[PDB]
Amino acid sequence: QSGSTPLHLTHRFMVWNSIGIIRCYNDEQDNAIDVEFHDTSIHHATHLSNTLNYTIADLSHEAILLACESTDELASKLHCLHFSSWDSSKEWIIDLPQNEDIEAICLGQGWAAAATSALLLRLFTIGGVQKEVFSLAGPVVSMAGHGEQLFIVYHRGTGFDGDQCLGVQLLELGKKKKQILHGDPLPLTRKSYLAWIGFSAEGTPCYVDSEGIVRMLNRGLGNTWTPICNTREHCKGKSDHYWVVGIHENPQQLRCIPCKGSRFPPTLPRPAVAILSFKLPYCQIATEKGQMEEQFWRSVIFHNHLDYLAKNGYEYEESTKNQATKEQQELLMKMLALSCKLEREFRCVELADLMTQNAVNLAIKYASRSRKLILAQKLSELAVEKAAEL
Amino acid sequence: MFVSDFRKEFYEVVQSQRVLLFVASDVDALCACKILQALFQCDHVQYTLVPVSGWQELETAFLEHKEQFHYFILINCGANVDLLDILQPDEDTIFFVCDTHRPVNVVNVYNDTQIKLLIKQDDDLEVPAYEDIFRTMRRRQRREWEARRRDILFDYEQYEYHGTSSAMVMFELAWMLSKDLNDMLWWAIVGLTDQWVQDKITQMKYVTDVGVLQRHVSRHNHRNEDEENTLSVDCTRISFEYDLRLVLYQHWSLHDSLCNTSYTAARFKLWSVHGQKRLQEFLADMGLPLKQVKQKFQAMDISLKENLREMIEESANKFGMKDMRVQTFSIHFGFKHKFLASDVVFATMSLMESPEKDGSGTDHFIQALDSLSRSNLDKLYHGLELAKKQLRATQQTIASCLCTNLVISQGPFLYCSLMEGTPDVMLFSRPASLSLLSKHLLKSFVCSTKNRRCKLLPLVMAAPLSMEHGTVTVVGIPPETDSSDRKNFFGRAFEKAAESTSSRMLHNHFDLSVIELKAEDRSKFLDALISLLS
Amino acid sequence: PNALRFHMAAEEMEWFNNYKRSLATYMRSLGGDEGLDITQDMKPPKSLYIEVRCLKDYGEFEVDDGTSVLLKKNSQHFLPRWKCEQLIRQGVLEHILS
Amino acid sequence: LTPAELIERLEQAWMNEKFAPELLESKPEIVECVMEQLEHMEENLRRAKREDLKVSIHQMEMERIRYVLSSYLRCRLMKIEKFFPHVLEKEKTRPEGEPSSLSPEELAFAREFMANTESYLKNVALKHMPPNLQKVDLFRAVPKPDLDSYVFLRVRERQENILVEPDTDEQRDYVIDLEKGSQHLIRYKTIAPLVASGAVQLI
Amino acid sequence: MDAAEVEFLAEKELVTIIPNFSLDKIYLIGGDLGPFNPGLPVEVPLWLAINLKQRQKCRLLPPEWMDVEKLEKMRDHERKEETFTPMPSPYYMELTKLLLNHASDNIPKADEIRTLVKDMWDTRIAKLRVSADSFVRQQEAHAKLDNLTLMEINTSGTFLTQALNHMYKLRTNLQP
């Protein structure tokens, strides 16, 4: 489970995300689960007697989900506390068939989903009614969700020479149901395994491998996978590493906990979340010519989520698009001026190809300053071309 | 009407307002007041706090403050009377009522605009339906309905008892707000233990509420702590204990604890000359040296103490005291500060009901309220010393009553009377201490007497109150059987006798089973009580 | 207090009245308007609100425009420190957290 | 002058006035600007809703600023009341260009204080005394501030060739250098211009 | 100057808290703070941190110097040197009292931290006593006290300065 620590610990995290934390302990005084939230205006902290040994968990804005394994006396179960409900009975419980066990679970906006050891996925509404059922394309490892999106990762085969053989199944369960990615293999760094999957806060799916590369579903580039950053350029050491809590597109943040000499943070004392910005791994990084296009491509790589929301039918804040487009246009204008004064023009045309009609009509001014007439001419011809491309 | 959600319909309402707390003089009320004070001080709610020791001073305080406050909170008072008739409020005030007393008055229940009851709906509540209580052949059926109303409402109002602790109610509010500190959980524990110490609830309900509080204790004990990461000694640690029923036994000698605990004193009959040899037989069966037993518990040899609880239980079982253990809690902090919930209960209770004449009852309330905060540990230890004195005086008074045979069986009920000028009567003149004395004395009497009839009777006790006005305080106690459900009828029996005789009965204490009575009228009042209970 | 005023000479009372008037003038002249009462804030501020206990049977004490608290003995109020400071100094109220 | 820097200069004046034996030169710009900030923030906060957290945070910060200002002014008023003939004589004899040790308000207070005290003394005893004894000059009655007091300091700007003078004998005088960030225990009279210029901070 | 005023100045030092509430950037006169995001660290003055802890609105983190190994190293260095060593904060004693009294639940090994800070305080007060005695005995007119903190000075400085004033007048009474 994303944001969870190994089961052999007697006191551990069952989930840590941008909503809150779920801890659980099995000490001599009691066995129980503690649920807490980052913002206490959401819901009060809760203590559940874990007599049924719930072991896999997930947390959301409106509900918490739990599940366990079977035993010879009793089968596996799915348990949920829909703490945001209106009605008198906030809990519900579901029991699985005999010799069948839940393997992974996840929450989404108004629904829950459980992947099963029998290569079966069951969808539920958050009141408890069962939605659709389908079979996975292999043994599952983990799940994630955001809005109507469902994100599943599974074993597609057997690995060789240290690599892992796995792929993604991605569904969009909204008013026009679809499968976006069907069985596609997932990239990851060689001789490493998948560490963390989850949706960035404004909606894009992302994941991190056990070397440290964080990468995102680039919906501006035909739904491919674009690496953003590593974690080991920020960190230092072999065993020391950063343990991920969540991603945000705007503000651009990676929430992560630095871990010393361990593959995960200790449960106590409470770790402090560090914030990591982003810097794409482009060439000629030390130059201003590199930094400007790094800024541009990082900006669009993150801000295409607004267009995804519009395509899906959501309303968004137009000021975000205004600011992002202005940032891209302004860095392009300044570097166009610098390159023009440095007496280069075809590179300026290539930069100006990314701009609006009004923007090129105004960039003719920067071309005119210092009297680069041929660059002004090609910007005018580009303006004609953009008038045609409308 | 009953408040369904304390967070939404009570706390978020009074959070924006000036509030007036009326607080009754009992340890559960004090603990609920401490929790609510902590919440209000977190949220900068400009409250005012007034202690009230009775109905008349509650009315006086309300007359003083009704112009300036629109929201009032009554802690351990108000639920068992018609507050609208008692206080005569303006049409647009609000009275929140967090009170353990039962049954709730039907006017309080079915008033839908002004009285708001901070009472758990799953308590022991059976309210009659509204149509049964509120509005030729037609008028004949009207009179028949009125007769049925009188029958049903007497059946409802007959037996008075206590519900869930107000401190626990306020702690559940704190938990829902997620501002529940460990000291707030300790105050909730102390409120429940006040109910248990004063025998206001059954053992089943006490065990159930302890089961509720155990889970909160576990949550607080795992907020920042486990078997390998641990906090400073400064921090407070609350622990569940299956501890001994002896009173204050970690703060004085085990001998004094066995002598001044009500249960063991009653069983061994230590009021009698012969009972000390029974106690010595018990200690010899345990194998504790008498010098160690008479030494202070903190100075006792540590080789005697690390299995003392199970040794006590094992010897008590073969002596016939089958329940010397009790499910309770303790608090530790620093290096040396350790208290059982019973210890804090007795200390705060003694600070309230202190025999000191200097100051006033409200000053003693203030001392008790201060002692519940850890910035006033000196006050808590002073309260422990006062509690030792109070327990000793209780046993001396019980011995005097039983040796002089003041407890006489008046047919339907046993009767006892304290006499003016006799020892410690001024200490026991206050109604709460008098109620505790009567309960302890009834247990001692039931263990003393050999008659099967006398072991089942209730008890009525009188004590002097006033000479400037010539009155006595009278309390009624139910029978002390283990089968008892801790409900008594004396609150209504007293007023039926008082109206049958037209006696000068005054009804100031919040419990109906405690009254003030003119010293001349006690004869005819008792005659009416024998006639009434039959 | 009157028991202390009887210790003072008449000329001492005249000097004290002149000093009070001059100090009030100086405090009034500090701000843009309504001055600054530098008699207040004699100790560094810790909490914005304090819990106070009535020691004397005072009458009523206004806290806002339309609101007041009855300063009856042993009542406890949770009030602003800057409002309660003078009464605590004069012994009417007792600050009751330490 | 940034508002944060203004509050910092207020704290500097507060501590210097605490530890200096004499009345230091006035900081009217500091007092006026701090009062302006407080009035403006009162105006801001009276136009905000109840139960708001940022309102309380601002009120707490204002309490702190108000406390430092009130304490500073109280200390200055203590010094004025203690040395009222000497500060008045200094103000009367002040040339053109050095700053005053009194604001106009403090000067009005000092003149009123001296007139009140002289009137009281005359009326009570000194009109009754014999004719040539009726005049005490308070310039001689009241003691002067003692400039040879020892003070702790921390030095903010490097100073060189500061002369220590242990006692009467000039042969034992010797110079020192005050490195930035160092802390010293020294007679005030040897460092008083540095305190005036802000090169050192009394502690 | 009172110890409470020294604490007032110590209260201006910055410490990191983890809010459980959401609040935008607040523009205090002494410099802007925030934004406050639930679950993330933010650096605020100590008075505000203590107030929020009392109102249960945040979790306080120990400063970087509140670590047992670092404090043991500093304590041993102080005990070995003859002069006052540089301290991890200019108000370390006040910081220790405030943070450990209000946030011992948040700060692990608080007993060890308090004992080590007490050791450093005892060593430095002993050094200050030696300095005062040497000043009076050798009849100095100047001393260098570079790494002393304000609370440490304020504990003894009024007495010392009064004594040195009397000593100066006694050794200069023959001046005319």
Side-chain angles (χ1 to χ4, degrees), chain D residues 104-119:
Chain D
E105 300 85 21
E106 291 176 328
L107 175 54
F109 173 82
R111 284 171 177 162
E112 293 167 35
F113 195 92
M114 186 166 208
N116 186 24
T117 308
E118 285 192 335
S119 175

PDB file of all heavy atoms in Angstrom, chain D residues 104-119:
ATOM      1  N   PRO D 104       9.470  67.051  23.354  1.00  0.00           N
ATOM      2  CA  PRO D 104       8.669  68.181  23.858  1.00  0.00           C
ATOM      3  C   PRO D 104       7.711  67.788  24.971  1.00  0.00           C
ATOM      4  O   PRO D 104       7.537  68.538  25.940  1.00  0.00           O
ATOM      5  CB  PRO D 104       7.935  68.668  22.605  1.00  0.00           C
ATOM      6  CG  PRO D 104       8.743  68.190  21.477  1.00  0.00           C
ATOM      7  CD  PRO D 104       9.329  66.898  21.898  1.00  0.00           C
ATOM      8  N   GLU D 105       7.110  66.604  24.869  1.00  0.00           N
ATOM      9  CA  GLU D 105       6.199  66.132  25.905  1.00  0.00           C
ATOM     10  C   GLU D 105       6.947  65.868  27.207  1.00  0.00           C
ATOM     11  O   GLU D 105       6.495  66.257  28.292  1.00  0.00           O
ATOM     12  CB  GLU D 105       5.474  64.871  25.432  1.00  0.00           C
ATOM     13  CG  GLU D 105       4.616  65.030  24.171  1.00  0.00           C
ATOM     14  CD  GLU D 105       5.372  64.892  22.857  1.00  0.00           C
ATOM     15  OE1 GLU D 105       6.466  64.292  22.838  1.00  0.00           O
ATOM     16  OE2 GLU D 105       4.862  65.389  21.831  1.00  0.00           O
ATOM     17  N   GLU D 106       8.093  65.189  27.116  1.00  0.00           N
ATOM     18  CA  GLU D 106       8.918  64.943  28.293  1.00  0.00           C
ATOM     19  C   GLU D 106       9.404  66.249  28.909  1.00  0.00           C
ATOM     20  O   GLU D 106       9.496  66.367  30.134  1.00  0.00           O
ATOM     21  CB  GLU D 106      10.101  64.050  27.927  1.00  0.00           C
ATOM     22  CG  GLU D 106       9.727  62.623  27.574  1.00  0.00           C
ATOM     23  CD  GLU D 106      10.906  61.790  27.115  1.00  0.00           C
ATOM     24  OE1 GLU D 106      11.840  62.352  26.507  1.00  0.00           O
ATOM     25  OE2 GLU D 106      10.897  60.566  27.363  1.00  0.00           O
ATOM     26  N   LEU D 107       9.733  67.235  28.076  1.00  0.00           N
ATOM     27  CA  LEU D 107      10.186  68.525  28.586  1.00  0.00           C
ATOM     28  C   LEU D 107       9.068  69.253  29.322  1.00  0.00           C
ATOM     29  O   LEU D 107       9.300  69.852  30.381  1.00  0.00           O
ATOM     30  CB  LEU D 107      10.723  69.375  27.434  1.00  0.00           C
ATOM     31  CG  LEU D 107      11.136  70.820  27.723  1.00  0.00           C
ATOM     32  CD1 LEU D 107      12.141  70.903  28.861  1.00  0.00           C
ATOM     33  CD2 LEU D 107      11.707  71.445  26.464  1.00  0.00           C
ATOM     34  N   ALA D 108       7.851  69.225  28.770  1.00  0.00           N
ATOM     35  CA  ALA D 108       6.712  69.814  29.466  1.00  0.00           C
ATOM     36  C   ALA D 108       6.471  69.117  30.799  1.00  0.00           C
ATOM     37  O   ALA D 108       6.243  69.775  31.825  1.00  0.00           O
ATOM     38  CB  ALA D 108       5.465  69.733  28.586  1.00  0.00           C
ATOM     39  N   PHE D 109       6.548  67.783  30.803  1.00  0.00           N
ATOM     40  CA  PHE D 109       6.394  67.026  32.041  1.00  0.00           C
ATOM     41  C   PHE D 109       7.467  67.403  33.054  1.00  0.00           C
ATOM     42  O   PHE D 109       7.178  67.550  34.245  1.00  0.00           O
ATOM     43  CB  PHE D 109       6.442  65.528  31.737  1.00  0.00           C
ATOM     44  CG  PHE D 109       6.471  64.654  32.961  1.00  0.00           C
ATOM     45  CD1 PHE D 109       5.302  64.336  33.629  1.00  0.00           C
ATOM     46  CD2 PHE D 109       7.667  64.137  33.434  1.00  0.00           C
ATOM     47  CE1 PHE D 109       5.326  63.534  34.750  1.00  0.00           C
ATOM     48  CE2 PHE D 109       7.695  63.339  34.555  1.00  0.00           C
ATOM     49  CZ  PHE D 109       6.524  63.034  35.212  1.00  0.00           C
ATOM     50  N   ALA D 110       8.712  67.559  32.599  1.00  0.00           N
ATOM     51  CA  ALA D 110       9.808  67.878  33.507  1.00  0.00           C
ATOM     52  C   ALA D 110       9.646  69.267  34.112  1.00  0.00           C
ATOM     53  O   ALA D 110       9.885  69.459  35.312  1.00  0.00           O
ATOM     54  CB  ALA D 110      11.141  67.766  32.768  1.00  0.00           C
ATOM     55  N   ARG D 111       9.254  70.250  33.296  1.00  0.00           N
ATOM     56  CA  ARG D 111       9.024  71.592  33.823  1.00  0.00           C
ATOM     57  C   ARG D 111       7.891  71.595  34.841  1.00  0.00           C
ATOM     58  O   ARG D 111       8.001  72.223  35.905  1.00  0.00           O
ATOM     59  CB  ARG D 111       8.719  72.561  32.682  1.00  0.00           C
ATOM     60  CG  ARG D 111       9.938  72.973  31.877  1.00  0.00           C
ATOM     61  CD  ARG D 111       9.544  73.761  30.640  1.00  0.00           C
ATOM     62  NE  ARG D 111      10.711  74.221  29.893  1.00  0.00           N
ATOM     63  CZ  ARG D 111      10.704  74.618  28.625  1.00  0.00           C
ATOM     64  NH1 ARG D 111       9.599  74.602  27.892  1.00  0.00           N
ATOM     65  NH2 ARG D 111      11.839  75.034  28.073  1.00  0.00           N
ATOM     66  N   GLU D 112       6.799  70.885  34.538  1.00  0.00           N
ATOM     67  CA  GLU D 112       5.692  70.798  35.486  1.00  0.00           C
ATOM     68  C   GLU D 112       6.126  70.118  36.780  1.00  0.00           C
ATOM     69  O   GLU D 112       5.751  70.554  37.875  1.00  0.00           O
ATOM     70  CB  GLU D 112       4.522  70.049  34.849  1.00  0.00           C
ATOM     71  CG  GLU D 112       3.868  70.797  33.695  1.00  0.00           C
ATOM     72  CD  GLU D 112       2.942  69.919  32.879  1.00  0.00           C
ATOM     73  OE1 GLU D 112       2.284  69.036  33.467  1.00  0.00           O
ATOM     74  OE2 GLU D 112       2.875  70.108  31.646  1.00  0.00           O
ATOM     75  N   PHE D 113       6.931  69.059  36.671  1.00  0.00           N
ATOM     76  CA  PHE D 113       7.406  68.342  37.851  1.00  0.00           C
ATOM     77  C   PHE D 113       8.268  69.240  38.729  1.00  0.00           C
ATOM     78  O   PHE D 113       8.107  69.267  39.956  1.00  0.00           O
ATOM     79  CB  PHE D 113       8.189  67.103  37.411  1.00  0.00           C
ATOM     80  CG  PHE D 113       8.426  66.105  38.510  1.00  0.00           C
ATOM     81  CD1 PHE D 113       7.538  65.066  38.721  1.00  0.00           C
ATOM     82  CD2 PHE D 113       9.542  66.198  39.322  1.00  0.00           C
ATOM     83  CE1 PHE D 113       7.755  64.145  39.726  1.00  0.00           C
ATOM     84  CE2 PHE D 113       9.763  65.281  40.329  1.00  0.00           C
ATOM     85  CZ  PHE D 113       8.868  64.253  40.530  1.00  0.00           C
ATOM     86  N   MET D 114       9.192  69.987  38.114  1.00  0.00           N
ATOM     87  CA  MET D 114      10.059  70.862  38.898  1.00  0.00           C
ATOM     88  C   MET D 114       9.262  71.971  39.572  1.00  0.00           C
ATOM     89  O   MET D 114       9.496  72.280  40.749  1.00  0.00           O
ATOM     90  CB  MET D 114      11.155  71.465  38.019  1.00  0.00           C
ATOM     91  CG  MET D 114      12.172  72.276  38.816  1.00  0.00           C
ATOM     92  SD  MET D 114      13.674  72.675  37.911  1.00  0.00           S
ATOM     93  CE  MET D 114      14.843  72.800  39.261  1.00  0.00           C
ATOM     94  N   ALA D 115       8.322  72.584  38.844  1.00  0.00           N
ATOM     95  CA  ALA D 115       7.512  73.643  39.437  1.00  0.00           C
ATOM     96  C   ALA D 115       6.683  73.112  40.600  1.00  0.00           C
ATOM     97  O   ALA D 115       6.610  73.744  41.662  1.00  0.00           O
ATOM     98  CB  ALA D 115       6.610  74.268  38.376  1.00  0.00           C
ATOM     99  N   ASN D 116       6.076  71.935  40.423  1.00  0.00           N
ATOM    100  CA  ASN D 116       5.273  71.331  41.479  1.00  0.00           C
ATOM    101  C   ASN D 116       6.113  71.030  42.715  1.00  0.00           C
ATOM    102  O   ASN D 116       5.700  71.326  43.846  1.00  0.00           O
ATOM    103  CB  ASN D 116       4.620  70.060  40.939  1.00  0.00           C
ATOM    104  CG  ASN D 116       3.655  69.434  41.914  1.00  0.00           C
ATOM    105  OD1 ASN D 116       3.113  70.107  42.789  1.00  0.00           O
ATOM    106  ND2 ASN D 116       3.436  68.133  41.770  1.00  0.00           N
ATOM    107  N   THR D 117       7.305  70.459  42.520  1.00  0.00           N
ATOM    108  CA  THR D 117       8.148  70.097  43.655  1.00  0.00           C
ATOM    109  C   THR D 117       8.634  71.334  44.404  1.00  0.00           C
ATOM    110  O   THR D 117       8.615  71.362  45.645  1.00  0.00           O
ATOM    111  CB  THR D 117       9.332  69.255  43.174  1.00  0.00           C
ATOM    112  OG1 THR D 117       8.852  68.164  42.379  1.00  0.00           O
ATOM    113  CG2 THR D 117      10.120  68.690  44.353  1.00  0.00           C
ATOM    114  N   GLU D 118       9.081  72.362  43.675  1.00  0.00           N
ATOM    115  CA  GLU D 118       9.537  73.583  44.331  1.00  0.00           C
ATOM    116  C   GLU D 118       8.400  74.258  45.088  1.00  0.00           C
ATOM    117  O   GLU D 118       8.596  74.747  46.211  1.00  0.00           O
ATOM    118  CB  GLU D 118      10.138  74.544  43.306  1.00  0.00           C
ATOM    119  CG  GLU D 118      11.518  74.146  42.816  1.00  0.00           C
ATOM    120  CD  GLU D 118      12.191  75.250  42.027  1.00  0.00           C
ATOM    121  OE1 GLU D 118      11.473  76.102  41.465  1.00  0.00           O
ATOM    122  OE2 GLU D 118      13.439  75.271  41.977  1.00  0.00           O
ATOM    123  N   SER D 119       7.202  74.289  44.493  1.00  0.00           N
ATOM    124  CA  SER D 119       6.050  74.871  45.171  1.00  0.00           C
ATOM    125  C   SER D 119       5.734  74.129  46.462  1.00  0.00           C
ATOM    126  O   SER D 119       5.492  74.756  47.503  1.00  0.00           O
ATOM    127  CB  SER D 119       4.841  74.854  44.236  1.00  0.00           C
ATOM    128  OG  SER D 119       3.672  75.297  44.898  1.00  0.00           O
TER     129      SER D 119
END
